Coordinates of C-alpha atoms and ligand atoms in Angstrom, one line a residue:
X1 CA 14.2 33.5 19.4
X2 CA 12.2 31.4 16.9
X3 CA 14.1 28.6 15.7
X4 CA 12.5 25.7 13.5
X5 CA 12.8 22.2 14.8
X6 CA 13.4 19.3 12.4
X7 CA 12.3 15.8 13.6
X8 CA 14.0 13.0 12.3
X9 CA 12.8 9.4 12.3
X10 CA 13.5 7.4 9.0
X11 CA 15.2 10.3 7.2
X12 CA 18.9 10.1 8.7
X13 CA 20.7 12.4 6.3
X14 CA 21.0 16.0 5.5
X15 CA 20.9 15.7 1.9
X16 CA 17.8 15.2 -0.4
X17 CA 15.4 15.7 2.4
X18 CA 11.9 17.2 1.6
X19 CA 10.8 18.2 5.0
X20 CA 14.5 19.5 6.2
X21 CA 14.6 21.6 2.8
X22 CA 11.3 22.8 3.5
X23 CA 12.1 24.2 6.8
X24 CA 15.4 25.6 5.7
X25 CA 13.6 28.0 3.0
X26 CA 11.9 29.3 6.2
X27 CA 15.1 29.5 8.8
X28 CA 18.5 29.3 9.2
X29 CA 18.2 28.7 12.6
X30 CA 17.5 25.2 12.0
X31 CA 18.0 22.4 14.7
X32 CA 17.7 18.7 14.3
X33 CA 16.4 16.5 16.8
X34 CA 15.8 12.8 17.1
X35 CA 13.7 11.1 20.0
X36 CA 14.5 7.7 21.3
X37 CA 11.0 6.3 21.8
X38 CA 11.0 3.3 24.4
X39 CA 7.5 2.2 22.7
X40 CA 10.0 1.3 19.4
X41 CA 13.1 0.7 21.3
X42 CA 11.8 -1.7 23.9
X43 CA 9.8 -3.5 21.5
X44 CA 10.2 -7.2 21.5
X45 CA 10.2 -6.8 17.7
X46 CA 13.2 -4.4 17.5
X47 CA 16.1 -6.2 15.7
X48 CA 19.8 -5.6 17.5
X49 CA 21.2 -5.2 13.8
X50 CA 18.5 -2.3 13.1
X51 CA 19.5 -0.5 16.2
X52 CA 23.2 -0.9 15.3
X53 CA 22.8 0.7 12.0
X54 CA 20.2 3.3 13.1
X55 CA 22.8 4.5 15.8
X56 CA 25.5 4.5 13.5
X57 CA 23.3 6.6 11.1
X58 CA 22.8 9.3 14.2
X59 CA 26.6 9.3 14.7
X60 CA 27.0 10.6 11.0
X61 CA 24.0 13.1 11.4
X62 CA 25.4 14.8 14.7
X63 CA 28.5 15.4 12.9
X64 CA 26.5 16.7 9.7
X65 CA 24.5 19.4 11.6
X66 CA 27.5 20.3 13.7
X67 CA 29.4 21.0 10.1
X68 CA 26.3 22.7 8.9
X69 CA 26.2 25.2 11.7
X70 CA 23.8 23.9 14.1
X71 CA 23.2 20.5 15.9
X72 CA 21.1 17.4 16.5
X73 CA 19.2 17.1 19.7
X74 CA 18.7 14.2 21.1
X75 CA 15.8 12.8 23.3
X76 CA 14.6 9.6 25.1
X77 CA 11.0 9.4 26.1
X78 CA 7.1 9.7 24.7
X79 CA 7.4 11.8 21.5
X80 CA 3.6 13.6 22.0
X81 CA 5.0 14.7 25.5
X82 CA 8.8 15.4 25.0
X83 CA 9.0 16.9 21.4
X84 CA 5.9 19.9 22.1
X85 CA 7.8 20.6 25.7
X86 CA 10.7 21.3 23.6
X87 CA 9.1 23.3 21.0
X88 CA 7.5 25.1 23.7
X89 CA 10.6 25.6 25.7
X90 CA 12.3 26.9 22.5
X91 CA 9.3 28.9 21.5
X92 CA 9.9 27.1 18.2
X93 CA 8.2 29.0 15.0
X94 CA 7.6 25.5 13.8
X95 CA 8.4 21.8 13.7
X96 CA 8.8 20.0 10.4
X97 CA 9.0 16.3 9.8
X98 CA 8.5 13.8 7.2
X99 CA 5.0 11.7 6.8
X100 CA 4.8 8.1 8.0
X101 CA 3.0 5.3 6.4
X102 CA 2.7 3.0 9.4
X103 CA -0.2 2.9 11.9
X104 CA 2.0 3.9 14.9
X105 CA 3.8 6.6 13.4
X106 CA 0.9 8.2 11.9
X107 CA -1.3 8.0 15.1
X108 CA 1.7 9.4 17.1
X109 CA 2.2 12.0 14.6
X110 CA -1.6 13.3 14.9
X111 CA -1.2 13.5 18.4
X112 CA 2.2 15.5 18.4
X113 CA 0.7 18.2 16.0
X114 CA -2.5 18.3 17.9
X115 CA -0.2 18.9 21.1
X116 CA 1.6 21.5 19.0
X117 CA -1.4 23.4 17.5
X118 CA -2.5 23.5 21.4
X119 CA 0.5 25.1 22.2
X120 CA -0.1 27.2 19.3
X121 CA 3.2 26.2 17.3
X122 CA 2.9 25.5 13.7
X123 CA 3.6 21.6 12.5
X124 CA 4.4 21.0 8.8
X125 CA 4.4 17.3 7.8
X126 CA 5.5 16.7 4.3
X127 CA 6.1 13.4 2.3
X128 CA 9.9 12.4 1.8
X129 CA 10.5 8.7 1.5
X130 CA 8.1 8.2 -1.6
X131 CA 9.0 9.5 -5.2
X132 CA 4.7 9.7 -4.9
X133 CA 2.9 10.1 -1.9
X134 CA -0.2 7.6 -1.5
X135 CA -2.4 10.2 -2.4
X136 CA -1.1 11.0 -5.7
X137 CA -1.7 7.5 -7.2
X138 CA -5.0 6.7 -7.5
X139 CA -7.4 5.2 -10.2
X140 CA -9.8 6.8 -12.5
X141 CA -12.3 6.3 -9.6
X142 CA -9.9 7.9 -7.2
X143 CA -9.2 4.5 -5.2
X144 CA -5.9 3.2 -4.1
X145 CA -4.7 -0.1 -5.9
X146 CA -4.9 -3.7 -4.7
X147 CA -3.1 -5.1 -7.8
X148 CA 0.5 -4.1 -8.9
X149 CA -0.2 -4.2 -12.9
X150 CA -2.3 -0.8 -12.6
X151 CA -0.4 0.4 -9.9
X152 CA 2.6 0.3 -11.8
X153 CA 1.1 1.7 -15.0
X154 CA 0.1 4.8 -13.2
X155 CA 3.1 5.5 -11.2
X156 CA 5.6 4.9 -14.0
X157 CA 3.5 7.7 -16.0
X158 CA 3.9 10.1 -13.2
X159 CA 6.6 12.8 -13.6
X160 CA 9.6 11.9 -11.4
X161 CA 10.7 14.5 -8.4
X162 CA 14.4 15.5 -8.5
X163 CA 16.5 15.9 -5.4
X164 CA 16.3 18.7 -3.3
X165 CA 19.3 20.9 -1.9
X166 CA 21.1 20.2 1.2
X167 CA 20.7 22.9 3.9
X168 CA 23.9 25.0 5.1
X169 CA 25.1 27.8 6.9
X170 CA 22.6 27.2 9.8
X171 CA 22.3 29.0 13.2
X172 CA 23.1 27.4 16.2
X173 CA 21.3 27.6 19.3
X174 CA 22.5 30.0 22.1
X175 CA 23.4 29.1 25.8
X176 CA 20.1 30.6 27.3
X177 CA 18.2 28.3 24.8
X178 CA 20.5 25.5 25.4
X179 CA 19.6 26.2 29.2
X180 CA 15.9 26.1 28.5
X181 CA 16.0 22.8 27.4
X182 CA 18.7 21.1 29.3
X183 CA 16.3 18.9 31.4
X184 CA 14.7 17.3 28.1
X185 CA 18.3 16.4 26.6
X186 CA 20.5 13.3 26.8
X187 CA 24.2 14.8 27.2
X188 CA 25.4 12.4 24.5
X189 CA 24.4 9.8 21.7
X190 CA 24.0 6.6 23.8
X191 CA 26.0 3.7 22.6
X192 CA 24.7 0.3 21.3
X193 CA 25.9 -0.9 24.5
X194 CA 24.4 1.5 26.6
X195 CA 20.8 0.8 25.0
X196 CA 21.4 -2.8 26.0
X197 CA 22.1 -4.3 22.4
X198 CA 24.9 -6.2 21.1
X199 CA 25.8 -6.6 17.3
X200 CA 28.9 -7.8 15.6
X201 CA 27.5 -9.4 12.3
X202 CA 28.0 -6.5 10.2
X203 CA 25.8 -4.6 7.7
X204 CA 24.8 -4.9 3.8
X205 CA 26.4 -1.2 3.7
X206 CA 28.0 0.6 6.5
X207 CA 25.9 3.0 8.4
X208 CA 25.6 6.6 7.3
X209 CA 24.5 9.3 4.6
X210 CA 28.2 9.0 3.2
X211 CA 28.3 5.3 3.0
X212 CA 25.0 4.9 1.7
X213 CA 25.6 7.7 -1.2
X214 CA 29.0 6.0 -2.1
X215 CA 26.9 2.6 -2.3
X216 CA 24.5 3.9 -4.6
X217 CA 27.2 5.5 -7.1
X218 CA 29.4 2.4 -7.1
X219 CA 26.2 0.2 -7.9
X220 CA 25.0 2.5 -10.3
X221 CA 28.3 2.7 -12.2
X222 CA 28.7 -0.7 -12.5
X223 CA 26.6 -3.8 -11.1
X224 CA 23.2 -2.5 -12.0
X225 CA 24.1 -3.1 -15.8
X226 CA 23.6 -6.9 -14.9
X227 CA 20.8 -6.5 -12.2
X228 CA 18.7 -8.8 -14.3
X229 CA 19.7 -11.8 -14.2
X230 CA 21.8 -11.4 -11.5
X231 CA 19.4 -10.3 -9.1
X232 CA 17.9 -14.2 -9.0
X233 CA 21.1 -15.8 -7.7
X234 CA 21.9 -15.4 -3.9
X235 CA 25.2 -16.8 -4.4
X236 CA 25.9 -13.7 -6.9
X237 CA 26.2 -10.1 -5.1
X238 CA 23.9 -8.8 -7.8
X239 CA 22.0 -6.4 -5.8
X240 CA 22.6 -3.0 -4.3
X241 CA 22.4 -3.7 -0.5
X242 CA 20.6 -0.5 0.1
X243 CA 17.6 -1.7 2.0
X244 CA 18.7 -0.6 5.1
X245 CA 19.6 3.0 3.9
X246 CA 16.4 3.2 2.4
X247 CA 14.7 2.1 5.3
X248 CA 16.2 4.7 7.7
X249 CA 16.7 7.5 4.9
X250 CA 20.7 7.2 5.1
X251 CA 19.8 7.7 1.3
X252 CA 17.2 9.9 -0.1
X253 CA 14.7 8.1 -2.6
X254 CA 15.1 11.1 -5.4
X255 CA 19.0 10.5 -5.5
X256 CA 18.2 6.6 -5.7
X257 CA 16.0 7.5 -8.8
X258 CA 18.1 9.9 -10.5
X259 CA 21.3 7.9 -10.1
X260 CA 19.4 4.8 -11.6
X261 CA 17.8 7.0 -14.2
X262 CA 21.3 8.8 -15.1
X263 CA 22.8 5.4 -15.7
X264 CA 20.2 4.3 -18.1
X265 CA 20.4 7.6 -20.1
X266 CA 24.5 6.6 -20.2
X267 CA 24.0 3.3 -21.0
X268 CA 24.0 2.5 -24.8
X269 CA 23.2 -1.2 -24.2
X270 CA 19.8 -2.6 -24.6
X271 CA 20.4 -5.3 -22.0
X272 CA 21.8 -2.5 -19.5
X273 CA 19.0 -0.8 -20.1
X274 CA 16.7 -3.3 -19.2
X275 CA 18.6 -4.1 -16.1
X276 CA 18.3 -0.7 -14.7
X277 CA 14.6 -0.1 -15.6
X278 CA 14.1 -3.6 -13.8
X279 CA 15.9 -2.3 -10.6
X280 CA 13.6 0.8 -10.8
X281 CA 10.9 -1.4 -10.9
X282 CA 11.8 -2.9 -7.6
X283 CA 11.4 0.8 -6.3
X284 CA 7.7 0.9 -7.7
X285 CA 7.3 -2.4 -5.8
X286 CA 8.4 -0.6 -2.7
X287 CA 6.0 2.1 -3.1
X288 CA 3.2 -0.3 -4.0
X289 CA 3.6 -2.0 -0.7
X290 CA 4.1 1.5 1.2
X291 CA 1.1 2.9 -0.5
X292 CA -0.8 -0.4 0.4
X293 CA -0.1 -0.3 4.1
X294 CA -1.3 3.6 4.0
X295 CA -4.5 2.7 2.3
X296 CA -5.3 -0.2 4.2
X297 CA -3.8 0.0 7.7
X298 CA -5.5 -3.2 8.6
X299 CA -2.8 -5.5 6.5
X300 CA -0.7 -4.9 9.4
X301 CA -2.9 -7.3 11.6
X302 CA -2.3 -10.3 9.6
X303 CA -4.1 -12.2 6.9
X304 CA -6.1 -9.6 4.9
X305 CA -8.3 -11.4 2.5
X306 CA -11.3 -13.1 4.4
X307 CA -10.7 -16.7 3.2
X308 CA -7.1 -16.3 5.1
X309 CA -8.4 -14.9 8.1
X310 CA -9.9 -18.3 8.8
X311 CA -7.3 -20.7 7.7
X312 CA -6.7 -23.7 10.1
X313 CA -2.9 -23.0 10.9
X314 CA -1.3 -26.1 12.4
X315 CA 1.1 -24.1 14.4
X316 CA 3.6 -26.6 15.7
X317 CA 6.1 -24.6 17.8
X318 CA 8.8 -27.2 17.3
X319 CA 9.0 -26.6 13.5
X320 CA 8.9 -22.6 13.9
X321 CA 11.9 -23.3 16.6
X322 CA 13.5 -25.7 13.9
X323 CA 13.1 -22.9 11.5
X324 CA 14.2 -19.9 13.4
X325 CA 17.1 -22.0 14.5
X326 CA 18.1 -22.9 10.5
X327 CA 17.5 -26.8 11.7
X328 CA 15.0 -27.7 9.1
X329 CA 17.1 -30.0 7.1
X330 CA 16.6 -28.0 4.0
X331 CA 19.9 -26.7 2.9
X332 CA 18.5 -23.8 0.6
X333 CA 16.2 -22.7 3.8
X334 CA 18.9 -23.2 6.5
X335 CA 21.5 -21.3 4.7
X336 CA 19.3 -18.3 4.2
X337 CA 18.2 -18.5 7.8
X338 CA 21.8 -18.4 9.0
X339 CA 22.4 -15.6 6.8
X340 CA 19.4 -13.8 8.3
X341 CA 20.6 -14.4 11.9
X342 CA 24.2 -14.0 11.4
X343 CA 24.4 -10.8 9.1
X344 CA 21.0 -9.3 9.7
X345 CA 20.2 -9.4 6.0
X346 CA 19.0 -12.2 3.6
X347 CA 18.8 -12.2 -0.4
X348 CA 15.3 -11.6 -1.6
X349 CA 15.1 -14.8 -3.4
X350 CA 16.0 -16.6 -0.1
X351 CA 13.7 -14.4 1.5
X352 CA 10.6 -15.8 -0.6
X353 CA 11.9 -19.5 -0.3
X354 CA 12.1 -19.5 3.5
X355 CA 8.8 -17.5 3.8
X356 CA 7.2 -20.1 1.5
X357 CA 8.6 -22.9 3.7
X358 CA 7.4 -21.3 6.9
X359 CA 3.9 -20.7 5.5
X360 CA 3.3 -23.7 3.0
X361 CA 5.7 -26.5 4.4
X362 CA 5.4 -26.0 8.2
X363 CA 2.0 -24.4 7.9
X364 CA 2.4 -21.9 10.7
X365 CA 0.5 -18.7 10.9
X366 CA 2.8 -16.4 9.0
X367 CA 2.6 -13.7 11.5
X368 CA 5.5 -15.7 13.5
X369 CA 7.7 -15.5 10.6
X370 CA 7.0 -11.7 10.2
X371 CA 7.7 -11.3 13.4
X372 CA 11.0 -13.1 13.4
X373 CA 12.3 -11.3 10.5
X374 CA 11.4 -8.0 11.9
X375 CA 13.5 -9.4 15.0
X376 CA 16.3 -9.8 12.7
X377 CA 16.4 -7.7 9.5
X378 CA 18.5 -4.7 9.6
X379 CA 16.3 -3.5 7.1
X380 CA 13.1 -4.7 8.8
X381 CA 10.3 -2.8 7.5
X382 CA 6.6 -3.5 7.9
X383 CA 5.1 -2.5 4.6
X384 CA 8.1 -4.4 2.8
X385 CA 7.8 -7.4 5.6
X386 CA 4.2 -7.6 5.8
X387 CA 4.0 -7.6 2.0
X388 CA 6.6 -10.3 2.0
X389 CA 4.7 -12.7 4.4
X390 CA 1.3 -11.6 3.0
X391 CA 2.7 -12.8 -0.2
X392 CA 3.8 -16.3 1.1
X393 CA -0.2 -17.0 1.3
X394 CA -1.6 -14.6 -1.5
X395 CA -3.4 -13.3 1.5
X396 CA -3.0 -9.5 1.0
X397 CA -2.3 -7.3 -1.9
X398 CA -1.9 -8.6 -5.6
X399 CA -3.0 -12.1 -4.8
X400 CA -2.2 -15.0 -7.0
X401 CA -3.5 -18.6 -7.6
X402 CA -2.6 -21.0 -4.9
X403 CA 1.0 -22.3 -5.3
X404 CA 3.8 -24.0 -3.1
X405 CA 7.4 -23.3 -3.7
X406 CA 9.3 -26.6 -3.9
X407 CA 12.7 -26.2 -2.1
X408 CA 14.5 -28.5 -4.3
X409 CA 13.4 -26.8 -7.5
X410 CA 14.2 -23.1 -6.4
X411 CA 17.4 -24.3 -5.1
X412 CA 18.4 -26.1 -8.4
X413 CA 17.2 -23.1 -10.2
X414 CA 18.5 -20.6 -8.3
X415 CA 21.6 -21.9 -6.6
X416 CA 22.3 -24.6 -9.2
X417 CA 26.0 -25.1 -8.0
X418 CA 25.0 -25.1 -4.3
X419 CA 27.3 -22.2 -3.9
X420 CA 25.1 -20.2 -1.7
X421 CA 24.3 -23.2 0.3
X422 CA 27.9 -24.5 1.0
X423 CA 28.7 -20.6 2.0
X424 CA 26.3 -20.6 4.7
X425 CA 26.5 -24.2 5.6
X426 CA 30.2 -24.7 5.8
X427 CA 30.0 -27.8 7.8
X428 CA 28.3 -29.4 4.5
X429 CA 31.1 -28.2 1.9
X430 CA 32.0 -31.9 1.6
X431 CA 28.6 -32.9 0.4
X432 CA 27.7 -32.7 -3.3
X433 CA 25.5 -30.0 -4.6
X434 CA 23.4 -32.2 -6.2
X435 CA 22.4 -33.6 -3.0
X436 CA 22.3 -30.3 -1.2
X437 CA 19.8 -29.2 -3.7
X438 CA 17.6 -32.1 -3.3
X439 CA 18.0 -32.1 0.5
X440 CA 18.6 -35.8 0.5
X441 CA 21.4 -36.4 2.3
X442 CA 22.8 -39.8 3.9
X443 CA 23.1 -39.7 7.7
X444 CA 26.8 -40.3 7.6
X445 CA 27.6 -37.7 5.1
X446 CA 25.2 -35.6 7.0
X447 CA 27.4 -35.5 9.9
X448 CA 25.6 -33.6 12.7
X449 CA 23.4 -31.8 10.1
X450 CA 19.8 -32.5 10.9
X451 CA 17.3 -34.5 8.7
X452 CA 14.4 -32.7 6.9
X453 CA 11.9 -32.1 9.6
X454 CA 9.0 -32.5 7.5
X455 CA 8.3 -34.6 4.1
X456 CA 7.5 -31.6 1.5
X457 CA 5.2 -33.8 -0.4
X458 CA 3.4 -34.6 2.5
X459 CA 3.1 -31.2 3.9
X460 CA 2.2 -29.9 0.3
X461 CA -0.9 -32.5 0.4
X462 CA -2.0 -31.1 3.9
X463 CA -1.8 -27.5 3.0
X464 CA -3.9 -28.1 -0.4
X465 CA -6.4 -30.1 1.7
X466 CA -7.0 -27.6 4.4
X467 CA -7.1 -25.0 1.9
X468 CA -9.7 -26.5 -0.4
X469 CA -11.8 -28.1 2.4
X470 CA -11.9 -24.1 3.8
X471 CA -12.4 -23.1 0.1
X472 CA -15.4 -25.4 0.1
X473 CA -16.8 -25.0 3.8
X474 CA -17.1 -21.1 2.4
Ligands
LIG501 C1 9.4 -12.7 3.2 C2 9.7 -11.3 2.8 C3 10.2 -10.2 3.4 C4 10.7 -9.2 3.3 N1 11.2 -8.2 4.1 C5 11.4 -7.0 4.0 C6 11.9 -5.9 5.1 O1 11.4 -6.2 6.0 N2 12.4 -4.7 4.4 C7 12.8 -4.4 3.4 O2 13.0 -3.2 2.6 N3 12.3 -5.5 2.6 C8 11.9 -6.8 2.6 N4 11.6 -7.7 1.6 C9 11.6 -7.4 0.1 C10 13.3 -7.4 -0.1 O3 13.5 -9.0 0.0 C11 14.4 -6.6 0.3 O4 13.9 -5.0 -0.1 C12 15.8 -6.7 -0.4 O5 16.2 -8.0 -0.1 C13 16.8 -5.7 -0.3 O6 18.1 -6.1 -0.7 P1 18.7 -5.1 -1.8 O7 18.7 -3.7 -1.3 O8 20.1 -5.4 -2.2 O9 17.5 -4.7 -2.8 P2 17.9 -4.3 -4.4 O10 17.3 -5.7 -5.0 O11 19.0 -3.7 -4.6 O12 16.3 -3.4 -4.4 C14 16.5 -1.9 -4.1 C15 15.2 -1.5 -3.2 O13 14.3 -2.0 -3.6 C16 13.3 -2.1 -2.6 N5 12.7 -3.6 -2.7 C17 13.3 -4.6 -3.7 N6 12.6 -5.6 -3.6 C18 11.3 -5.2 -3.0 C19 10.2 -5.6 -2.8 N7 10.0 -7.0 -3.0 N8 9.2 -5.2 -1.6 C20 9.4 -4.3 -1.2 N9 10.8 -3.2 -1.5 C21 11.7 -3.9 -2.3 C22 14.2 -2.2 -1.2 O14 13.9 -0.8 -0.7 C23 15.8 -2.1 -2.2 O15 16.9 -1.6 -0.9 C24 11.0 -8.9 2.0 C25 10.6 -9.9 0.9 C26 10.1 -10.9 1.2 C27 9.7 -12.2 0.6

């Protein structure tokens, strides 16, 4: 026969899926597939929490396809070899999938497509994870943006796309077809343990399309109205917690935008309106960094701006280790690192703090931090993670004047009552917020909690000194 294969990667859902919808308009014999790629799964940068969330998403996706009328095929191996082989064995009319913005995915995709073209099989690659593709947002000179402001002004004025239809009444494969591909398939979805992973720390939102959609709806129904200023406080549960759903596509970007937009139209309060616009802004920042990675792939290599490619990083392994183990002695920093390692998620204000701390205070090549975050974030995303770490030094996009966060000031400003500190550092619940914020704790009252591993003021001067010496040397 002539079925169409849809290749899932970061769009683990049946609803509001550009590529899937386009494929369904071409054939009802729509068969989904997912390939466990060893280069990604065996990577030292793979987070256990991310594999757990992913596996949970795949489980639901299997059901969705089954309920739709067909199935989700599962494979394990090199994509450019297995996908074309599968398509050929199935004499596929075509293979569809949504475009990636990352170096690895785009290179791989080019290879799969070329392999398919050689086999004489059509490959269709459409944009789905962004409201606007990188090629849609360009300046008057037709160039990409490296500064947020102007990018936002353009992006904001562009007509927003709406959710596409969920495919239905699919036609499943026949025994003869199933026999032709048997050797390429896994008999069942491997469990987290079978893959060699273990995770018991939970998630910001339960895995799956259904849970993602429920969270989006619940958030936009209430919490979003207070997004600003509730977003600034780690102690408050003021954010959506949809990050992993967006990274793995458990939710469609158009559904997200439409939900927020409908909430803004329904709201009759200026403050709420503003809160919702602010949340929408976050989605814009998301596209700013994704577009940036797309347009400037070298960003993924580390410090982008020339000066920073030459920064004299101290790199004291011991300080890094202390940082990864939440033993820095800075309460606000340790409480954040603990939440990360224990739950695979961290409040953005906290990520900004620990990143600033690692880069500015500990003076460690921020790539070590970027890597550590990727090894633990359930939402670990190259574009966003790299953007965040380039940000800790203004070494990439949207650069700002040299600046160093003061842990105490941030803590006092965003966790004034030390509620968040106490929450993740229970062995310090007896200490007074006053001291947890200043980071100056008396030994006895400190119990086993380590003392600050560095003197902020001395580190601050050291960093500025190196910066200036280099700035001058250049
Ligand atoms: C050093 C550091 C590393 C980071 N690592 C990642 C990462 O690997 N993956 C990840 O998706 N985000 C990352 N962020 C951005 C950010 O902290 C999160 O997206 C956020 O914590 C997600 O929580 P939420 O879903 O409740 O966000 P909400 O506030 O509800 O925002 C909604 C959505 O907007 C997007 N978003 C929000 N903040 C930004 C931003 N600053 N940059 C890019 N997208 C944004 C996310 O997709 C998010 O789910 C990083 C930030 C820093 C400073």
